[PDB]
Design a protein around this motif. Sequence first.
Motif, PDB file in Angstrom:
ATOM      1  N   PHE A 165      96.850 -19.477 -44.163  1.00  0.00           N
ATOM      2  CA  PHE A 165      96.477 -19.030 -45.495  1.00  0.00           C
ATOM      3  C   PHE A 165      96.362 -17.513 -45.508  1.00  0.00           C
ATOM      4  O   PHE A 165      95.839 -16.913 -44.565  1.00  0.00           O
ATOM      5  N   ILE A 166      96.851 -16.893 -46.582  1.00  0.00           N
ATOM      6  CA  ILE A 166      96.814 -15.436 -46.670  1.00  0.00           C
ATOM      7  C   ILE A 166      95.375 -14.941 -46.717  1.00  0.00           C
ATOM      8  O   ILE A 166      95.054 -13.876 -46.178  1.00  0.00           O
ATOM      9  N   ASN A 167      94.490 -15.697 -47.371  1.00  0.00           N
ATOM     10  CA  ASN A 167      93.058 -15.391 -47.458  1.00  0.00           C
ATOM     11  C   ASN A 167      92.230 -16.618 -47.050  1.00  0.00           C
ATOM     12  O   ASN A 167      91.720 -17.380 -47.871  1.00  0.00           O
ATOM     13  N   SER A 168      92.056 -16.773 -45.734  1.00  0.00           N
ATOM     14  CA  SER A 168      91.351 -17.936 -45.200  1.00  0.00           C
ATOM     15  C   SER A 168      89.906 -17.991 -45.673  1.00  0.00           C
ATOM     16  O   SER A 168      89.336 -19.081 -45.792  1.00  0.00           O
ATOM     17  N   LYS A 171      85.251 -16.537 -51.543  1.00  0.00           N
ATOM     18  CA  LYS A 171      84.075 -16.973 -52.282  1.00  0.00           C
ATOM     19  C   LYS A 171      84.348 -16.848 -53.773  1.00  0.00           C
ATOM     20  O   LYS A 171      84.940 -15.864 -54.225  1.00  0.00           O
ATOM     21  N   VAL A 172      83.918 -17.853 -54.533  1.00  0.00           N
ATOM     22  CA  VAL A 172      84.188 -17.912 -55.964  1.00  0.00           C
ATOM     23  C   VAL A 172      83.119 -18.769 -56.620  1.00  0.00           C
ATOM     24  O   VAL A 172      82.620 -19.727 -56.029  1.00  0.00           O
ATOM     25  N   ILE A 173      82.766 -18.415 -57.857  1.00  0.00           N
ATOM     26  CA  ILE A 173      81.775 -19.188 -58.591  1.00  0.00           C
ATOM     27  C   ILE A 173      82.311 -20.590 -58.830  1.00  0.00           C
ATOM     28  O   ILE A 173      83.525 -20.799 -58.958  1.00  0.00           O
ATOM     29  N   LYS A 174      81.406 -21.561 -58.877  1.00  0.00           N
ATOM     30  CA  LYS A 174      81.804 -22.946 -59.078  1.00  0.00           C
ATOM     31  C   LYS A 174      82.446 -23.121 -60.447  1.00  0.00           C
ATOM     32  O   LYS A 174      82.017 -22.522 -61.435  1.00  0.00           O
ATOM     33  N   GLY A 175      83.489 -23.947 -60.496  1.00  0.00           N
ATOM     34  CA  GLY A 175      84.144 -24.291 -61.736  1.00  0.00           C
ATOM     35  C   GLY A 175      85.255 -23.357 -62.167  1.00  0.00           C
ATOM     36  O   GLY A 175      85.933 -23.653 -63.158  1.00  0.00           O
ATOM     37  N   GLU A 176      85.466 -22.245 -61.467  1.00  0.00           N
ATOM     38  CA  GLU A 176      86.568 -21.338 -61.766  1.00  0.00           C
ATOM     39  C   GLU A 176      87.757 -21.740 -60.904  1.00  0.00           C
ATOM     40  O   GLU A 176      87.651 -21.780 -59.674  1.00  0.00           O
ATOM     41  N   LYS A 177      88.880 -22.035 -61.545  1.00  0.00           N
ATOM     42  CA  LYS A 177      90.086 -22.366 -60.801  1.00  0.00           C
ATOM     43  C   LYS A 177      90.588 -21.134 -60.060  1.00  0.00           C
ATOM     44  O   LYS A 177      90.730 -20.058 -60.647  1.00  0.00           O
ATOM     45  N   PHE A 178      90.830 -21.290 -58.763  1.00  0.00           N
ATOM     46  CA  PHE A 178      91.300 -20.221 -57.893  1.00  0.00           C
ATOM     47  C   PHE A 178      92.597 -20.662 -57.221  1.00  0.00           C
ATOM     48  O   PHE A 178      93.145 -21.724 -57.524  1.00  0.00           O
ATOM     49  N   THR A 179      93.088 -19.835 -56.301  1.00  0.00           N
ATOM     50  CA  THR A 179      94.346 -20.105 -55.622  1.00  0.00           C
ATOM     51  C   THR A 179      94.300 -19.535 -54.215  1.00  0.00           C
ATOM     52  O   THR A 179      93.709 -18.476 -53.987  1.00  0.00           O
ATOM     53  N   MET A 180      94.920 -20.250 -53.280  1.00  0.00           N
ATOM     54  CA  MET A 180      95.079 -19.803 -51.904  1.00  0.00           C
ATOM     55  C   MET A 180      96.543 -19.941 -51.518  1.00  0.00           C
ATOM     56  O   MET A 180      97.119 -21.025 -51.642  1.00  0.00           O
ATOM     57  N   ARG A 181      97.137 -18.851 -51.044  1.00  0.00           N
ATOM     58  CA  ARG A 181      98.563 -18.811 -50.738  1.00  0.00           C
ATOM     59  C   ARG A 181      98.775 -19.309 -49.312  1.00  0.00           C
ATOM     60  O   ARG A 181      98.378 -18.646 -48.348  1.00  0.00           O
ATOM     61  N   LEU A 182      99.414 -20.468 -49.179  1.00  0.00           N
ATOM     62  CA  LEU A 182      99.679 -21.078 -47.880  1.00  0.00           C
ATOM     63  C   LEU A 182     101.066 -20.651 -47.418  1.00  0.00           C
ATOM     64  O   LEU A 182     102.077 -21.136 -47.938  1.00  0.00           O
ATOM     65  N   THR A 243     110.270 -18.082 -44.256  1.00  0.00           N
ATOM     66  CA  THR A 243     108.907 -18.370 -44.675  1.00  0.00           C
ATOM     67  C   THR A 243     108.893 -18.814 -46.131  1.00  0.00           C
ATOM     68  O   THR A 243     109.789 -18.473 -46.909  1.00  0.00           O
ATOM     69  N   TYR A 244     107.868 -19.585 -46.488  1.00  0.00           N
ATOM     70  CA  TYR A 244     107.638 -20.002 -47.861  1.00  0.00           C
ATOM     71  C   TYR A 244     106.171 -19.799 -48.205  1.00  0.00           C
ATOM     72  O   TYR A 244     105.302 -19.852 -47.333  1.00  0.00           O
ATOM     73  N   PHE A 245     105.907 -19.561 -49.486  1.00  0.00           N
ATOM     74  CA  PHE A 245     104.560 -19.375 -50.018  1.00  0.00           C
ATOM     75  C   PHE A 245     104.240 -20.579 -50.896  1.00  0.00           C
ATOM     76  O   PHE A 245     104.561 -20.603 -52.084  1.00  0.00           O
ATOM     77  N   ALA A 246     103.598 -21.582 -50.301  1.00  0.00           N
ATOM     78  CA  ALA A 246     103.153 -22.760 -51.043  1.00  0.00           C
ATOM     79  C   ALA A 246     101.882 -22.386 -51.798  1.00  0.00           C
ATOM     80  O   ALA A 246     100.759 -22.702 -51.398  1.00  0.00           O
ATOM     81  N   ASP A 247     102.070 -21.690 -52.914  1.00  0.00           N
ATOM     82  CA  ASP A 247     100.946 -21.223 -53.719  1.00  0.00           C
ATOM     83  C   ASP A 247     100.232 -22.416 -54.337  1.00  0.00           C
ATOM     84  O   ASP A 247     100.774 -23.085 -55.222  1.00  0.00           O
ATOM     85  N   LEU A 248      99.014 -22.679 -53.874  1.00  0.00           N
ATOM     86  CA  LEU A 248      98.200 -23.789 -54.345  1.00  0.00           C
ATOM     87  C   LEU A 248      97.144 -23.295 -55.325  1.00  0.00           C
ATOM     88  O   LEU A 248      96.721 -22.138 -55.278  1.00  0.00           O
ATOM     89  N   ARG A 249      96.729 -24.190 -56.219  1.00  0.00           N
ATOM     90  CA  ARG A 249      95.660 -23.935 -57.176  1.00  0.00           C
ATOM     91  C   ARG A 249      94.610 -25.024 -57.030  1.00  0.00           C
ATOM     92  O   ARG A 249      94.945 -26.212 -57.017  1.00  0.00           O
ATOM     93  N   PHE A 250      93.345 -24.619 -56.930  1.00  0.00           N
ATOM     94  CA  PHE A 250      92.233 -25.527 -56.697  1.00  0.00           C
ATOM     95  C   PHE A 250      91.168 -25.325 -57.762  1.00  0.00           C
ATOM     96  O   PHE A 250      91.245 -24.416 -58.591  1.00  0.00           O
ATOM     97  N   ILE A 251      90.167 -26.200 -57.731  1.00  0.00           N
ATOM     98  CA  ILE A 251      88.926 -25.974 -58.467  1.00  0.00           C
ATOM     99  C   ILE A 251      87.850 -26.861 -57.859  1.00  0.00           C
ATOM    100  O   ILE A 251      88.098 -28.023 -57.522  1.00  0.00           O
TER     101      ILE A 251
END
Lengths: 286, 56
Positions: A165-168, A171-182, A243-251
Motif C-alpha cells: 500500500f502506498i500509505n500503509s 487516520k481518518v474520521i469515522k464515516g468518511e469514505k477514504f482510499t488506499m492505493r494498492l 505495476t498496477y495501482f488497484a485503487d480501492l475505496r473504503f468506509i
Amino acid sequence: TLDKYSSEEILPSFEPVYSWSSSLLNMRLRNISLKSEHCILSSLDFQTSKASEQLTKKFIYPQEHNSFLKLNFQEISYKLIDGTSQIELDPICPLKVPLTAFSYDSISATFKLVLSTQPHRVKITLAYELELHPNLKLPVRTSWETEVTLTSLVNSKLSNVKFKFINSNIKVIKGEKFTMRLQIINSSSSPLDLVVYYNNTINPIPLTLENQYQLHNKYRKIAEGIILLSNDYKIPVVPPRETYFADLRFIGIMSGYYGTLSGLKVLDLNTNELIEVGNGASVLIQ
Amino acid sequence: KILPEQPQLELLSTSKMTRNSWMMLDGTKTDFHITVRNKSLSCAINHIKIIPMNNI
C-alpha cells in the motif's frame, strides 16, 4: 678483536708463553532494531554498582549509618569509529551533560542510527568525578569500544508478485469514505487476473470463555467494522514486469484500530491462491 | 599510488516508490523525495551533479 684481546691477555708468571703438550558503576548496551523505520536504537544504560554500596560504609563515610556518593558526570560521549576516523553521535532527547548523580542511580541514553552485512564500531566514553567534600574531587575517564550487534511488504507464495500500500498508515474520521492505493508489482512470467474482495462474515470460532469471546469479538470487529465500496473488483490486466495501482475505496462504521486488517484478501485467479494482502494496512478510524 | 580517503553513498530510501517502481498516467506529473546518506566518517563531499538518463 680476538688478536687485540689475546695480545692483552696477562701471561702467567712462571710459565712458557706457548706449550705444545697439554568500577563504581556498571554499564551495558541493550540495542534494539526496527525494520519498520530501517533504523537501530542503541541504548546504553549505566547504574551505580554493588561495589559502590559496599564502599559507601567502608572508606567514604564509615561513621554514617546511610551515606551516598556524589558522582558528577562531566561528559558522556558516544562515538562511531572507522579505522582512524571518529565521529560523535548525538542523542534523541537533550541530555544535561554536566549530570549529577548519587547512590542507587541509573541513567539511560538512546542513540538512533541507520541500519546489512557491515556491523558498526562504537566507543562509549564516560568521564565523571566523585565529589567527596566540596574541596577535593577524584576524576575517572573510563571508555570502551564494541560493535552494535543485535512485514509491511508482502509477497506471494509459488510466484514472484509483490504487494504494498502506498500509505500503509492512515487516520481518518469515522464515516468518511477514504482510499488506499494498492500497488501490485508483477515480475514473474505472465499477466495476472487476480481479484480483490472483502468478506464481512464472522469467521467461525474453532478453550475457556475468556479466550473464546475475545476471539469472537476480534472476528466480529474485523467482519463488520469496514466495508469496501468496490468489492469483487476485477483488476483488469497487469502484464509481466509491470505495476498496477488497484485503487480501492473504503468506509468504516465502527471506530477502532484495525492494525493488520484481515478480511481484505486478494485471490489470484490463475492458481486459486489466497494471498492475504491485508497485512500491509494499519487503518485507524476515530 | 595511494590517494586520500573517498566516501560512499547508498540510496537510503525513496519516498513514494517501492523497489524503484511506479506508474504514470501519460500526462500527469508527480514528484517525490530521494534520501541519501554519506557513509564515510571523515570525508565530506563538496560536489554533486545529477544527470537524468532514460531507456529511449
